[model samples]
Target: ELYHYQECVRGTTVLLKEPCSSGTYEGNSPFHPLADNKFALTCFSTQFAFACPDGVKHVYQLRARS
Candidate 1:
């Protein structure tokens, strides 16, 4: 699952299976779960979408999965 800050609010967060790729940001964050983790960051991607008062930024979980 992908987790990211909602409305860029550190206190608020969101979860999803995928994120948009139109106009947003993509970076590695510590909100991802580890197989065994926080010492390492899980690579992820995010997308920004227009909304009412609060723009939504979708989050995508991407990591080494075998």
Candidate 2:
């Protein structure tokens, strides 16, 4: 499975597909089974799409470096 995450609230959001390429995990995190995992990171890539619990499409995107 993949774990999705972002650098910051407005930072780059990464996916796919375990830990952020940023090398932050330093250990490991479960993207699946938990259903609530922080991502950078190893997520499903652009091919993946999700919606918030409210039933709306997630509009998360990468932003310019701050």
Candidate 3:
């Protein structure tokens, strides 16, 4: 499964802020049992008004089956 956040802001005024589902599990995996589990968050600055600033610092968490 995948998760993401959508944000809309116009100079300090937030039009919308919500969580969205980006993708779904493809299949079951023997190594993880939970199948192919993956999560990601992305912000398209050009697509939204309230998005991460260019060159701004951000934090992310990632995990995968080895």
Using all chains and alpha carbons, the TM-scores for the candidates as numbered come to: 0.24, 0.26, 0.15
Better model by lDDT: candidate 2 vs candidate 3:
2
Clashes of each: 0, 12, 0
Predictions: Cα RMSD each: 12.8, 11.6, 16.7
The Cα local distance difference test for each model comes to: 0.35, 0.35, 0.26
Off by over 4 Å in 2: 1-36, 42-49, 64-66
Stretches of candidate 3 above 4 Å error? 1-51, 54-56
lDDT for model 3 = 0.26
Q: What digit string (tens of lDDT, one per residue) describes model 3 on residues 19-58?
A: 2223122312211222233232322232211123343323
Arrange candidates by TM-score, descending.
2, 1, 3
Tens-digit lDDT track for model 1 on 1-66?
Answer: 334442332333444433332333445444343232112332233333222223564443333222
**Cα misplacement distance, residue 64 of candidate 2 (Å):** 4.2
Could you tell me which residue pairs clash in candidate 3? Answer: none
Better of 1 and 3 by TM-score: 1
What would the per-residue lDDT of candidate 2 be over residues 1-66, giving only the tens digit for each residue? 333334333334444332222222222333332233544443322233444444444433332334
